[PDB]
Amino acid sequence: MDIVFAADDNYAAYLCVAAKSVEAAHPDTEIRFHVLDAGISEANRAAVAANLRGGGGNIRFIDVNPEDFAGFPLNIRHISITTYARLKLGEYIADCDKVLYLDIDVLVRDSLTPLWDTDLGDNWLGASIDLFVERQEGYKQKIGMADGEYYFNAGVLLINLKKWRRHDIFKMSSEWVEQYKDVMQYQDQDILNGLFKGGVCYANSRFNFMPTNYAFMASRHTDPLYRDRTNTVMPVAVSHYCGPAKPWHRDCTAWGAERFTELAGSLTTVPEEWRGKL
Ligand SMILES: O=c1ccn([C@@H]2O[C@H](COP(=O)(O)OP(=O)(O)O[C@H]3O[C@H](CO)[C@H](O)[C@H](O)[C@H]3F)[C@@H](O)[C@H]2O)c(=O)[nH]1
Ligand SMILES: [Mn+2]
Numbered sequence: 001m002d003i004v005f006a007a008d009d010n011y012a013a014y015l016c017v018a019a020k021s022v023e024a025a026h027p028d029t030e031i032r033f034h035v036l037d038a039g040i041s042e043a044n045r046a047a048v049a050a051n052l053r054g055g056g057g058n059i060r061f062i063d064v065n066p067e068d069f070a071g072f073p074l075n076i077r078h079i080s081i082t083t084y085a086r087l088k089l090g091e092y093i094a095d096c097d098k099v100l101y102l103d104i105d106v107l108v109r110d111s112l113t114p115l116w117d118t119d120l121g122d123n124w125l126g127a128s129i130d131l132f133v134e135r136q137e138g139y140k141q142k143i144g145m146a147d148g149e150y151y152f153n154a155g156v157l158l159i160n161l162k163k164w165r166r167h168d169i170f171k172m173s174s175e176w177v178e179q180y181k182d183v184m185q186y187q188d189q190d191i192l193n194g195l196f197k198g199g200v201c202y203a204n205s206r207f208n209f210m211p212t213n214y215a216f217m218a219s220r221h222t223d224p225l226y227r228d229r230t231n232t233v234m235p236v237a238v239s240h241y242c243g244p245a246k247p248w249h250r251d252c253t254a255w256g257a258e259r260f261t262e263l264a265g266s267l268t269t270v271p272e273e274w275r276g277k278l
Contacts, residue, residue: 001029001116004089004101004159006036008066008082011104012044013274014248016051017263021108023053024263025237029113033059034093038066038082043271050269062092068170072177073187078244084188086154087173090164097162102238103155105246107259110237115207120160125192126201127152128208129230132242133186135220142183143190149197150226154189155240156208158201169195205232210242214255248277 003022007015015035023031033052037045040061049056069084085092086101093099100116102108118126130153133139140151173191177184184190202225205213213232221227239256241247247260264270264278 001026001112002032002034002093002096002099004034004036004086004093004099005104006038006064006082006085006101007040007104008038008080009040009044010080011082012040012048013277014104014246015040016048016267017248017260017278018102018104018106018108019048019052019059020263020267021106021259022102022112025108025111026113029111031058034096034099035059035061036064036082036085036089036092037061038064038080038085043273047269047271047274051267064088064092071174073181073184075185076187078246079187086157086188087191088170089159090161090167090169093161094165097160099159099161101157101159103240103242105241106155107239107241107247107256107263108237109239109256109259110206110235112207112237115156115158115203115237118158118201118203120158120201122160122163122199123201124160124163124196124199126158126203127154128156128203128205129153129226130189130210130212131205131216131220131230132210132212133189139185143180143194145193145197148223150200150202150221150229151193152200152202153208153210153240153242154192155210155242156203156238157192158203202229204228205230206234206237208238208240209236210240211245211254 247257
């Protein structure tokens with residue numbers, strides 16, 4: 001399968017751990033990594049690759065200009081401008097009709113094949129629902145969504161790249177931002193939801209298990225589809241540490257954070273400059 005990550009130099013060490021978590025969960029599946037590189041040093045690219053399978057034979061870094069998204073809001077402190085690079089995925093990747101995009105703060109704990117094998121039809125992408133935002137009274141509607149259109153989290157996206165390449169996603173994104181810049185609270189995540197509402201395939205929350213999903217272990221909608229998708233089917237396949245509390249931080253009470261440390265400790269090569277970060 002084809003996996004996409006996006007990272008600037010600051011997240012290079014975390015990218016490596018996340019990527020290794022994907023390889024570990026797929027011992028007999030070819031994993032082709034495509035990294036939207038917003039400024040990763042040559043040393044860090046070599047180090048990320050040195051730790052992956054075959055010494056990095058299956059990872060390609062794609063240069064992205066962070067200035068491209070200079071006009072987009074960045075109100076969430078722990079998030080850098082690189083978070084918007086995903087918007088030009090159709091411009092950055094030509095060889096794939098479908099790719100599975102993952103945030104850097106994820107820890108894959110089970111096979112992603114069921115998600116990867118999902119037939120997206122003419123939908124724009126497949127994603128898991130964000131319980132936190134969905135229950136934020138009146139927010140969803142502020143960005144033009146209907147009660148029946150579920151707000152998805154942008155941290156795990158099975159993207160119908162072939163469809164994306166038929167459109168100018170960045171231009172559509174820019175126009176949407178112009179329209180909702182004064183109300184959007186979740187940056188790139190809002191853009192994706194606004195542009196694709198009504199054309200989203202929903203995946204089970206096991207593929208994007210966040211703190212709120214853990215805490216839910218009332219129910220916002222009676223809709224059986226909503227309930228089916230938000231009721232996580234064990235085991236968790238993807239741990240997503242959405243929010244300020246990261247597994248590489250101090251006092252991370254987030255569930256499954258220990259797997260991060262175990263993986264970081266298994267690294268083949270660990271640059272002196274990564275010692276602190278990891
Ligand atoms: O120093 C940094 C910080 C962030 N990033 C990128 O930005 C993504 C954005 O943020 P987090 O993973 O930390 O975001 P968070 O999960 O907290 O937020 C929710 O809202 C975010 C809004 O901008 C994104 O859409 C994200 O995918 C979604 F899950 C990262 O995965 C990473 O690719 C970097 O490269 N370097
Ligand atoms: Mn994230």
